[PDB]
């Protein structure tokens, strides 16, 4: 199956409360394995998975320096971007960075990512060819020109295609008991009366990994999409995920509504019915 | 500045069975900025020992957090999640439904 590694960096400025808040987290497809918080009691990269802990002290001493370097740049980027948009230091602002790589089922490189955001909107992003950038406005083009001279696109392409991928494979092998295992969802339905002539069929899916899943309600084969309550895939707190879909079925028609569940852990897509 | 309203989901890690310990989850997602107050309520009172996950965001740069606490539900205790954000005038409270 396909995999991916992605790191997430959030820097929120505190005007009167001192240095900006910096949070860094790293994932493997849905599994957080590292964290860093500038306000945490530990100023080192802390592990969140058992398979990342088998790395020697040289790994953590290195990843601590790198994550401290990201915080220093975001601390500077906050002031730089504040000047680009001629903004006052009277308020707080948000700088978010995300980068990583995707691999296909053959574990070959599939796509690379490197993106910035300022105050919740896209600021600059590395394009698919891993050679050019996308600059939103003049402030972003200033950054684009600065990164072109520094040869930043070339450094990422060597990392996204060569290091992000190679170390993803190392993480997969070290956590094959966890990351390469697929836990199929446990499906069930619930029936609840809402009126004298209407009822609520809620199609459930719990304890599955990864979080990619698809819940669909059909009526006589037609996809019920406009009238179908769907909730965002939520975490359970132990590593698995949950999701449910609901439709308001008139009394007596429950027999012609069908729920469809698609997931990587299912050999064939499930078709659930009431009665 | 861009502001996005948080989406709230109150639920439990395991199917609620009165008398057995479980985890009460409140998953706030799709909001911006990250400054947000999330408290878990038991019969209207705030629960003290409440832990949260690490801050992360989605494809569209919207953050998400999971606030959880260990509890033991009963047939009479009512639980709710109170979330206050810059996009909400009055703090929103979502009661815990056993079937949602």
């Amino acid at each position: 199956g396909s995999h991916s590694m992605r790191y997430f960096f959030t820097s929120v400025s505190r005007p009167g409360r001192g240095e900006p808040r910096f949070i860094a987290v790293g994932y493997v497809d849905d599994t957080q394995f590292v964290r860093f918080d500038s306000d945490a009691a530990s100023q080192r990269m802390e592990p969140r998975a058992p398979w990342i802990e088998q790395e020697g002290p040289e790994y953590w001493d290195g990843e601590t320096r790198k994550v401290k370097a990201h915080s220093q740049t975001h601390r500077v980027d906050l002031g730089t971007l504040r000047g680009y948009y001629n903004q006052s230091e009277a308020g707080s602002h948000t700088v978010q960075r995300m980068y990583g790589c995707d691999v296909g089922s053959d574990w070959r490189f599939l796509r690379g990512y490197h993106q910035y955001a300022y105050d919740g909107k896209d600021y600059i992003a590395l394009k698919e060819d891993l050679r050019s950038w996308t600059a939103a406005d003049m402030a972003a083009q200033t950054t684009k020109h600065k990164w072109e001279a520094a040869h930043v696109a070339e450094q990422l392409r060597a990392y996204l295609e060569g290091t992000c991928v190679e170390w993803l494979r190392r993480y997969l092998e070290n956590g094959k008991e966890t990351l390469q295992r697929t836990d199929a969802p446990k499906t069930h339905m619930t029936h609840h009366a809402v009126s004298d002539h209407e009822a609520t069929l809620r199609c459930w899916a719990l304890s599955f990994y990864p979080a990619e899943i698809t819940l669909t309600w059909q009526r006589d084969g037609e996809d019920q999409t406009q009238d179908t309550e769907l909730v965002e895939t939520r975490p359970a707190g132990d590593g698995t995920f949950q999701k449910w879909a609901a439709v308001v079925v008139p009394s007596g028609q429950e027999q012609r509504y069908t729920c469809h569940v698609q997931h990587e852990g299912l050999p064939k897509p499930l078709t659930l019915r009431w009665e | 500045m861009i502001q996005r309203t948080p989406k709230i989901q109150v639920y439990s890690r395991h199917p609620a069975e009165n008398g057995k310990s479980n985890f009460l989850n409140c998953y706030v997602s799709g909001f911006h900025p990250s400054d947000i107050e999330v408290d878990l309520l038991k019969n209207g009172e705030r629960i003290e020992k409440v832990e949260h996950s690490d801050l992360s965001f989605s494809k569209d740069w919207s953050f998400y957090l999971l606030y959880y606490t260990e509890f033991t539900p009963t047939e009479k205790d009512e639980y709710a999640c109170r979330v206050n954000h810059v996009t909400l005038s009055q703090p929103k409270i979502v009661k815990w439904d056993r079937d949602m």
């Epitope: 058992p50 966890t178 836990d183 | 020992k49």
Partner: T-cell receptor, first 108, second 112 residues
Framework: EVEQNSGPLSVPEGAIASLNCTYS??????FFWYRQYSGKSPELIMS????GDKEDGRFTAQLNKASQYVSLLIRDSQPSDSATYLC???????????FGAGTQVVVT | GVTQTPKFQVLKTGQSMTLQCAQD?????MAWYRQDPGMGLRLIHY???????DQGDVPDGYKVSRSTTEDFPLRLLSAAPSQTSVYFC??????????????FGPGTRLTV
């Protein structure tokens, strides 16, 4: 790896039996206490997940993720508590439960 | 909830018996542990589903089969003096997503 006392802890009747275990995997999330009488099977008596203390009956389990050690306190030790107590630790989304050597308690 | 067949069974050196285990709780995860004075419960093998076996901490010298959700028997190829231990069987509702508490069987004392 889970290290325990690995020795008979003699606690008089009515005292507080205190045994502890240390785990190696820092990212562990679930911690359990199993008691096992001589010849019988281990049964789950206490499970703690959040950093702090948790009491249920005469049993009290403490968790300290900073020092990476779990302890268990037995208030009002009785001869019915004389058994080997096993400490089990696990990580998220995993079925490999790591059990310690066990600490035998002999209450008179 | 969990039952094991060979209560207090003695074996020989060559081509010994195979210990059986079963549970009527429709559990996905099942495991075999070994208990020795001074070492504790040591994982032999575990299965997270039907036809899905995996090796634990001491897989050298053991073969396990998982053909049904209920039965999870532990086989012994050839008995060694190191096989003298008490074999326990455990299970839990699922490999993940459920309550991680483990249910143990009555056990099996064995000497060589």
């Amino acid at each position: 790896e889970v290290e325990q006392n690995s020795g008979p802890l003699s606690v008089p009747e009515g005292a507080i039996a205190s045994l502890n275990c240390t785990y190696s995997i820092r990212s562990s999330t679930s911690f359990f206490w199993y008691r096992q009488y001589s010849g019988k099977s281990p049964e789950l008596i206490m499970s703690i997940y959040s950093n702090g203390d948790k009491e249920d009956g005469r049993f009290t389990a403490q968790l300290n993720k900073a020092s990476q050690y779990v302890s268990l306190l037995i208030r009002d030790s009785q001869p019915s508590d004389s058994a080997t107590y096993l400490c089990a630790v696990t990580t998220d989304r995993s079925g490999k439960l790591q059990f310690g050597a066990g600490t035998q308690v002999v209450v008179t | 909830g969990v039952t094991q067949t060979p209560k207090f069974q003695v074996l020989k050196t060559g081509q010994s018996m195979t210990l059986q285990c079963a549970q009527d709780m429709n559990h996905e995860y099942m495991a075999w542990y070994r208990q020795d004075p001074g070492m504790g419960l040591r994982l032999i093998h575990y299965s997270v589903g039907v036809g899905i076996t995996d090796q634990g901490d001491v897989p050298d010298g053991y073969k396990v089969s998982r053909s049904t959700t209920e039965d999870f028997p532990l086989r012994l190829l050839s008995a060694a003096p190191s096989q003298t231990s008490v074999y326990f069987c455990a299970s839990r509702p699922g490999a993940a997503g459920g309550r991680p508490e483990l249910y143990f069987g009555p056990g099996t004392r064995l000497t060589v």
